[PDB]
């Protein structure tokens, strides 16, 4: 029993983190086979950041302008190129600790673990979700750029996020590992604003199922509803609409608890309209939307990784 | 900016986890140098658990009754002994991945990371606190016994917890790595109950400081209070008393924010007496007590590990 915000084990990613220095700027890099991936803004000086021309800035650099350290060892940079908003640094040594990996571009609502790093060294691991407005609510300080987000799928590390910047509201924005931003952001210091955020409905329902599995049942009722009546109420409270795909995804949890998805929707509708009235669910006084249906299954059925 | 429930990176512990089988029972073990540590109840059968005599049960075993697997490799058991409630299995091979480590018995209020494991393989990592009643609010399923709790201090892994059992309220109890239980529990299947839990006051104050550091200031006020008036209110709400040692521990956070400890106590007093009135702090609608002053400093100043 119990239910915690659980991250993947980070060992396989820890051995891929390196430190990258260009000029006076140091941040983190991801070392896989013989390539080091890092945010391209590492080549910017203070003057460049309002409106950098990255092609110009990169053509002015040579291999020896990039200092790459893996612990004490220096890695010799033998080539460099730019893909979208990442820099790719070819080095003379292939990382002997390269895990089996893939690069994946995730969708809003999905969750992943972040390994926060400074100067190439892991500081901590935590779980977060890609919000509907393509920001993440992370925890990052100066020097954290290049820290990555990942999931583990059997024996394979799927990298889905590399950290680039913080917005004035305190939330975070970054790219996939091919350098494409999530969201409408660009890597220059101009005023940019995130869309309004919404609550990830399918995740809230998954977490209400986790609550039932753990014996928290006070919010259940005998009612049922339709997708159409549910979505009408949901849109009024800034909740994402529920689709049939969502209902099918919640299948295994409905089966294991014997509570139909649309029955659980009727409970959520009531919680939205009346609030929780100082009761808690799974130790929370707010409805929690950063667990996916798969996160719940994994943690309530005990899935491991190789 | 930002503030998350952040665990230590788990890589150094992942390479120490093994699977231990005795009879029909399989659980996890901790492999350091040439010794495998695991809960001694792995030697019990269903008949033994109401009232096991562990000295009897162990004298009836031989080295070949214990199957220890590190991945695919089998480890040959060459000796066994019992220390308090752990079993120590001497094996023919010293773990080549043994980190620098120490064993530490922690006190209530301290936090640590748990690496939850099944069949010797890491499932997930999360942070939790030792509660004042010596339970932890974990997330564990069948097969999780032998999973460990740890902190990292520079380059050194400090192991402080090994998982043994779940209580009927859904919370968890275990031992230090020398086999001594935290709390009044024993490893037999008799009715046992935890003391009443209290809220860890010094951690709540540390988290209110994190909130100020992150720009959440609505709860501050101009008042101040004394330790004695504060503790009188605190005891009425099942909060632990605040000592001078606590006040000094909060020093670096008071300095960094310029809000005196006893000023912050006056804010907490108000929050206890009036509640939060549907406002949130750091994304929570309840007062959070599983961050220590050191956790806050580490995450708001960016400390890393080697
Ligand atoms: C990577 N090492 C570092 C990580 C941040 C430090 C604090 N927490 C973070 O996550 N990121 C950067 O250095 C990043 C690089 C420059 C400046 N960067 C910022 O994150 C900064 N924010 C920022 O400029 N944000 C935008 C502009 S703004 O804040 O509205 C302003 C008022 C015009 C300054 C620009 C990006 C989109 C959102 C708004 C800051 C946190 C250091 C101030 C670059 C963006 C290239
Ligand atoms: C380790 N692999 C495993 C982990 C638990 C499985 C589910 N989640 C857990 O953390 N632990 C055990 O197998 C442990 C070993 C036997 C039985 N154990 C239990 O955890 C069980 N609880 C239990 O017996 N608890 C106490 C008794 S009771 O529950 O009040 C009862 C009504 C008399 C059965 C005994 C210990 C102190 C607290 C109360 C259970 C979760 C499997 C039912 C031993 C305790 C030796």
Written account of the structure:
By secondary structure, chain A is α+β, with helices and mostly antiparallel strands. Among the domains of chain A are: about 10-90, Trypsin-like serine proteases (Thrombin, subunit H, Beta Barrel), CATH 2.40.10.10; about 200-300, main proteinase (3clpro) structure, domain 3 (Orthogonal Bundle). Chain A has eight helices and 13 strands. The first copy, chain A, has helices at about 10-15, 55-60, 200-215, 225-235, 245-250, 250-255, 260-275, 295-300, and strands at about 15-20, 25-30, 35-40, 65-70, 75, 75-85, 85-90, 100-105, 110-120, 120-130, 150-155, 155-165, 170-175. In chain A, a hairpin with a 2-residue loop joins strand 2 (about 25-30) and strand 3. The two termini of chain A are about 25 Å apart. At the A-B interface, helix 1, strand 9, strand 10 and helix 8 of A face helix 1, strand 9, strand 10 and helix 8 of B. The complex binds ligand NB2 (2 copies). One ligand NB2 binds near residues 27, 41, 167, 172 and 189 of chain B. Chains A, B: It is found in: Host cytoplasm; Host Golgi apparatus; Host nucleus. Chains A, B: This is 3C-like proteinase nsp5. Chains A, B: 3CL-PRO exists as monomer and homodimer. Only the homodimer shows catalytic activity. Interacts with host FBXO22; this interaction promotes the proteasomal degradation of nsp5.
């Amino acid at each position: 029993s119990g239910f915690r915000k659980m991250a993947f084990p980070s060992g396989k990613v820890e051995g891929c983190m390196v430190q990258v220095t260009c000029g006076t700027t140091t941040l983190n890099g991801l070392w896989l086979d013989d390539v080091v991936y890092c945010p391209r803004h590492v080549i910017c000086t203070s003057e460049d950041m309002l409106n950098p021309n990255y092609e110009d800035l990169l053509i002015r650099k040579s291999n020896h302008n990039f200092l790459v350290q893996a612990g004490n060892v220096q890695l010799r940079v033998i080539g460099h190129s730019m893909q979208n908003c990442v820099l790719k640094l070819k080095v003379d040594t292939a990382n002997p600790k390269t895990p089996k990996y893939k690069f994946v571009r995730i969708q809003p609502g999905q969750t992943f673990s972040v390994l926060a790093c400074y100067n190439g060294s892991p500081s901590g691991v935590y779980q977060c979700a890609m919000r509907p407005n393509f920001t993440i609510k992370g925890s990052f300080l100066n020097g954290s750029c290049g820290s990555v987000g990942f999931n583990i799928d059997y024996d394979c590390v799927s990298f889905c996020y590399m950290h680039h910047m913080e917005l004035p509201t305190g939330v975070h924005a970054g790219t996939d590992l091919e350098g494409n931003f999530y969201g409408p952001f660009v890597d220059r210091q101009t005023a940019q604003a995130a869309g309004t955020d919404t609550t990830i409905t399918v995740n809230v329902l998954a977490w209400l199922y986790a609550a039932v599995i753990n014996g928290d049942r006070w919010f259940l009722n005998r009612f049922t509803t339709t997708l159409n009546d549910f979505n009408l109420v949901a849109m009024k409270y800034n909740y994402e609409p529920l689709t049939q795909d969502h209902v099918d995804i919640l299948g295994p949890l409905s089966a294991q608890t014997g509570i139909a998805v649309l029955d659980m929707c009727a409970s959520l509708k009531e919680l939205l309209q009346n609030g929780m009235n100082g009761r808690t669910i799974l130790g929370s006084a707010l409805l929690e939307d950063e667990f996916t249906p798969f996160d719940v299954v994994r943690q309530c059925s005990g899935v491991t990784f190789q």
